[PDB]
């Protein structure tokens, strides 16, 4: 529905969602946006209530600004928070290699304090990181990608703690103010007070409490019952806040004349210093959140308060003791209890500006924390709002930040969603964040909540799962890093047709209704009783009659990627998420196809590619051609909207962007306009709805073995091309520099008879390996040779030159046609790194025509190598001739799970083949229901279904029974799954019926050349001359130690030894036997651990002398 | 080096002669520095580039 270019992949909606697809993607941006704070977002936020939100900026400004000296006589302030505007299709930078950005102006204002005066100055600030419609930032035509680090909400937090000693429940809580130090109270073993602050032994609190002014009375009074503390007033022995205080204070420093400071100053400072003591408003906010506190209090500050301090303290006491709720004076009550890290309300998440903002923050700070410095020194008088500016270091970082911004991580432009996934991708680790070398599984741990939060399934994978992820599906997330699941907030067998974005918490209080659930068409789930998670998410049954809220659909904590394959309910999650991640590693070959089957996700998902040239106006078409297309913006109005092609990925792939229609036709904004990449008929082309079947065969689909057609070739089905950029600079240095001529020493002809006038050939030109390349050259040196030579040269007049004959030449597995020409000169002004005056970068096609053996696959994780190629003929094949797509061993699924593969595929041939319900007279019962409408399948046509919703077996099965028998109204197929092809070879019948079908799959960014290597020899650590592994190099595989042990298990000695010597780095035998070799002869028998020799020396060295004899 | 600077040095002192202390000072100082040779802050403040 709601789809301009809509077809219909007819699905199986047994259900309904009034709700509809959010926009995801939005995300950050918005932030950014908000961070910015556009009168957009401004409007945005602005709407949906929202008092006085603020572009993540200001703030900045005001969180410091305005300004002033320490002399209290020069007053600066700010203003004009804002920017200018970019200067490119970005696309420009893209090509133009720089990054995309737009200038910043802002208008602070200094003011004397003496006279007090005026120094505004709408100062420029910075051209700036300018996002993308992809909501992104492709530094210098080059973007990484940032995800947010999950972050359990900071704050003073609570628990019981037992002591096997006595087992007593020394509960407690910390304090953790942003940037504010620490200080914590803790159910003492023996009486009483988990006093000490951010690591200071312990005290009698009140010494601090009283220390601020507290008659031991006042407490006991308000705090005698409240007896354990009474002990505190006991052992507290010492008195006089001050007496303490100062004494404390020593407890602080320690050792120092307790000046009144000791009596207060820093103390307050310490944590009454929003000057520096600076928790988090949201926390701040929290806080109240903690405890129905001031609450009625649109507040904001680091305003520490002994007030609440003690408050929650006696909270402690009251609890350790067991006590439900209770209301502090005024402060409405709170049911007592510890806390949790685990749950997610415990647990916010970060976001750009936020970051940024932090970054930046110090940035100014920094750069800021200077004018101060200078402010002063910067004599009064003529010292303009300018005079003292220099954000430079800011962007320096900032800018920089990206450099280092390890979390910005180059968008794997391998497929769309893949890139997506990358988007929504989410963890909580790294810079300042965790260091997996320190985190208990729990980190990875499951837990209830979780639903409607992030794909249960997917995750990292190596030592990595339970560490990272994304969102679930819908539920937006807090203006403060917390999900926003709306719900079927039910009402009296009549759910309240109503979103309710929810932070798990709260909520937690509430009643877990069930999607997939039969209402009396009214909310009135027709049963009296139901189930539902409870306090512990206690997925508990119950009488329908009682919940507050149901849900928002089925399937939600899901991921998109998650959201992708049915039969789940039959299939290994392991295997699953496996396929999940898998999913991505398709490889947009060429053909473009969609599984005739597949849910709705799909392009409606894919649309969220938001990539395809896609309508902008109900305009009629206009001129068209594969670069763009003029667009009759029917307001007269037009715009030859463009279209890209032949431009590499992060992974070597075109810019292709295939059209749709006709320069004359007529259509309307937002509707499609032209695919391109992973973009089958407006849709991730992703595989091949492909026959094949069931046998494990002649041992070739065995142990992962895999048996594969061939026609394929021919068919071509399997290829695209791939892209290196091809670079090689012209440099500058000692003996001269790095020329790029075309002349060359005793170079072959043609070898040159090929390049351009002065080096490399010309675009779209074919090659191979070795193939020389550049037109480079460099001075050689100056250190004589043997007369012998020269002489020799005199002998052959080959009057040698003297220049470091230098250039480039094609390595291995390499060919195609000329492309790149990023020949960019320093000298030609083309800014570039030192000692260089230019550089080109180039590209070449190569259509990868799919080797067998390799690996592909599709849904049901159901990965699959690519064993053998196999000619057509020679092939089991329709009794109607037509043979397989390939075949399939058995076995795994059993010990695996994923049989939908089976079903789905049944299905496959089905759809692929269509049918019609011959319900006629009446009803296929199992029919008697369901998307009726179908009734049939026009042999082969569009077919989707819901996730946790779709027809059934029997049905499905019975669907089997159903049919669109072929030409000869035939169905070699059995209402059964197993027919009986014969042999494209020997040919005869088979033993028994033949299970078979079809399956779209996908193809792999992982094969030989990805990893096709060894190494005969090459470079060698100018230090530990080991195989200098490298590009030019094959690396030359390293070796293991066990291994060695293996030897041992034999003792080939030598062998190993040898190694150690040889290929290890036997300078000699390397040379030496290398010779031998060269001379092929009873090899220079293994010598001596040489070096080892060193040792000795090495020893001696320390008076160490000794010896064997 | 260092050493060299030293034996060369407080050595080269010798020769001259004076309230030794001086020499002691180095001397040990040397020793030390040596030791350093042996290992660094192994004793006391390890030297650090």
């Amino acid at each position: 529905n709601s789809v301009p270019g809509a077809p219909n992949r007819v699905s199986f909606a047994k259900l309904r969602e009034p709700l509809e697809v959010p926009g995801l993607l939005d995300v950050q941006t918005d932030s950014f946006e908000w961070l910015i704070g556009s009168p957009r977002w401004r409007e945005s936020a602005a709407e949906r209530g929202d008092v006085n939100p603020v572009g993540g900026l200001e703030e900045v400004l005001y969180e410091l600004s305005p300004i002033e000296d320490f002399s209290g006589s020069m007053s600066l302030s700010f203003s004009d928070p804002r920017f200018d505007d970019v200067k490119a299709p970005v696309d420009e930078c893209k090509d133009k290699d720089m990054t995309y950005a737009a200038p910043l102006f802002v208008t602070a204002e200094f003011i004397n304090n003496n006279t007090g005066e005026i120094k505004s100055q709408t100062v420029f600030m910075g051209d700036f990181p300018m996002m993308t419609e992809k909501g992104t930032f492709i530094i210098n035509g080059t973007e990484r990608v940032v995800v947010s680090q999950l972050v359990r909400s900071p704050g003073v937090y609570f628990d019981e703690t037992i002591d096997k000693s006595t087992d007593k429940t020394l509960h407690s809580v910390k304090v953790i103010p942003s940037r504010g130090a620490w200080l914590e109270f803790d159910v003492d073993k023996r009486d009483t007070v988990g006093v000490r602050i951010d690591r200071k032994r312990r005290q009698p609190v009140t010494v601090l409490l009283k220390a601020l002014g507290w008659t031991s009375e006042q407490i006991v009074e308000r705090f005698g019952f409240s007896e354990i503390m009474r002990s505190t007033l006991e052992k507290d022995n010492t008195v006089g806040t001050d007496e303490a205080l100062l004494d404390i204070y020593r407890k602080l420093r320690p050792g120092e004349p307790p000046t009144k400071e000791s009596a207060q100053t820093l103390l307050e400072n310490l944590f009454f210093k929003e000057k520096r003591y600076d928790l988090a408003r949201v926390g701040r906010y929290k806080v109240n959140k903690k405890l129905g506190l001031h609450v009625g209090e649109p507040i904001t500050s680091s305003t520490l308060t002994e007030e609440d301090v003690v408050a929650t303290i006696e909270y402690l006491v009251r609890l350790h003791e067991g006590q439900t709720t209770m209301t502090v004076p005024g402060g409405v009550e709170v049911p007592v209890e510890t806390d949790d890290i685990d749950h997610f309300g415990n647990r916010r998440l970060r976001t750009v500006g936020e970051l940024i903002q932090n970054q930046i923050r110090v940035g100014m700070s920094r750069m800021e924390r200077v004018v101060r410095e200078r402010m002063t020194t910067q004599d009064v008088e003529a010292i303009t709002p300018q005079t003292l500016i220099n954000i430079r270091p800011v962007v320096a970082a900032i800018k920089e930040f990206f450099g280092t911004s390890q979390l910005s991580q180059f968008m794997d432009q391998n497929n769309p969603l893949s890139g997506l996934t990358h988007k929504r991708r989410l963890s909580a680790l790294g810079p300042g964040g965790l260091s997996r070398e320190r985190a208990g599984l729990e980190v990875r741990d499951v837990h209830p909540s979780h639903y409607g939060r992030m794909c249960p399934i997917e995750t990292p994978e190596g030592p990595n799962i339970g560490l990272i992820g994304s969102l679930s599906v819908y539920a937006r997330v807090n203006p403060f890093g917390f999900i926003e699941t709306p719900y079927r907030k039910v009402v009296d067998g009549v759910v309240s047709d109503e979103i309710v974005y929810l932070t798990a918490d709260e909520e937690d209080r509430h009643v877990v209704a069930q999607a997939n659930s039969p209402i009396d068409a009214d909310g009135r789930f027709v049963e009296p009783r139901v189930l539902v998670r409870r306090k512990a998410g206690e997925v508990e049954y119950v009488p329908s009659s009682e919940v507050d809220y149901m849900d928002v659909s089925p399937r939600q904590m899901v991921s998109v990627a998650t959201a992708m394959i049915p039969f789940l309910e039959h299939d290994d999650a392991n295997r699953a998420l496996m396929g999940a991640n898998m999913q991505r590693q398709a490889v947009p070959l060429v053909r473009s196809e969609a599984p005739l089957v597949g849910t709705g996700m799909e392009l409606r998902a894919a649309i969220d590619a938001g990539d395809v040239v896609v309508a902008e106006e109900s305009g009629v078409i206009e001129e068209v051609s594969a670069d763009y297309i003029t667009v009759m913006h029917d307001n007269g109005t037009r715009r030859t909207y463009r279209m890209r092609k032949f431009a590499r990925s992060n992974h070597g792939t075109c810019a292709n962007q295939c059209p749709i229609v006709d320069a004359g036709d007529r259509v309307e904004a937002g509707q499609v306009i032209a695919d391109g990449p992973c973009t089958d008929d407006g849709e991730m082309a992703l595989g091949k709805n492909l026959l094949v079947a069931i046998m494990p065969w002649e041992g070739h689909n065995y142990e992962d073995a895999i048996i594969l057609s061939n026609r394929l070739v021919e068919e071509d089905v399997l290829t695209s091309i791939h892209i290196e950029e091809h670079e090689i600079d012209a440099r500058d240095t000692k003996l001269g520099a790095e020329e790029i001529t075309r002349d060359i020493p005793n170079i072959s002809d043609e070898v040159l008879a090929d390049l351009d006038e002065r080096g490399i050939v010309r675009i779209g030109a074919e090659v191979r390996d070795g193939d020389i390349l550049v037109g480079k050259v460099t001075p050689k040196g100056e250190t004589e040779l043997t007369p012998e030579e020269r002489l020799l040269r005199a002998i052959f007049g080959e009057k040698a030159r003297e220049v470091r004959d230098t250039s480039l030449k094609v390595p291995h597995g390499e060919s195609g046609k000329v492309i790149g020409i990023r020949v960019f000169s320093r000298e030609d002004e083309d800014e570039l790194p030192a000692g260089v005056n230019e550089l080109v970068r180039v590209y070449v096609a190569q259509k990868r025509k799919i080797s067998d053996g390799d690996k592909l696959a599709g849904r049901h994780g159901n990965k699959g190598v690519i064993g053998k190629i196999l000619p057509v003929e020679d092939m089991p094949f329709l009794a109607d001739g037509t043979p397989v797509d390939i075949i399939l061993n058995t076995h795994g699924v059993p010990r695996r799970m994923n049989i939908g593969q089976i079903l789905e595929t049944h299905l496959g041939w089905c759809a692929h083949s269509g049918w019609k319900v011959d319900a006629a007279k009446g009803v296929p019962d199992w029919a008697a229901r369901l998307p009726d409408e179908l009734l049939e399948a026009q042999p082969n046509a569009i077919v989707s279904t819901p996730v946790f919703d779709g027809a059934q077996e029997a049905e499905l099965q019975g669907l089997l029974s159903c049919t669109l028998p072929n030409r000869d109204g035939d169905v070699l197929v059995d209402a059964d799954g197993k027919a009986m092809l014969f042999d494209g070879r020997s040919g005869e019948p088979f033993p028994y019926p033949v299970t078979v079908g079809y399956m779209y799959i996908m193809k792999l960014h992982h094969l030989v050349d990805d990893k096709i290597h060894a190494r005969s020899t090459g470079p060698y650590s100018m230090i530990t001359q080991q195989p200098l592994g490298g590009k030019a190099q094959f690396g030359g595989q390293r070796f293991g130690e066990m291994e060695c042990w293996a030897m041992q298990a034999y003792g080939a000695a030598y062998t190993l030894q040898e190694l150690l010597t040889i290929k290890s780095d036997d300078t000699v035998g390397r040379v030496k036997v290398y010779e031998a070799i060269v001379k092929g002869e009873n090899i220079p028998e293994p010598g001596i651990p040489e070096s080892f020799k060193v040792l000795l020396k090495e020893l001696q060295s320390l008076c160490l002398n000794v010896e064997v004899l | 080096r260092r050493v060299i600077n030293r034996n060369n040095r407080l050595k080269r002192l010798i020769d001259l002669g004076a309230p030794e202390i001086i020499v002691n000072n180095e001397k040990r100082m040397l020793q030390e520095s040596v030791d350093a040779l042996f290992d660094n802050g192994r004793r006391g403040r390890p030297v650090t580039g």
Binding site: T192, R201, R202, Q203, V207, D236 | R43
Partner: peptide
């Protein structure tokens, strides 16, 4: 008595040894 406990021990060495550092 609102003292946690092992200020000594630790503080007593790091004091002690600390001195020891004063040997350098």
């Amino acid at each position: 008595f609102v003292w946690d406990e092992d200020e000594s021990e630790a503080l007593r060495q790091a004091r002690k040894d600390a001195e020891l550092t004063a040997s350098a």
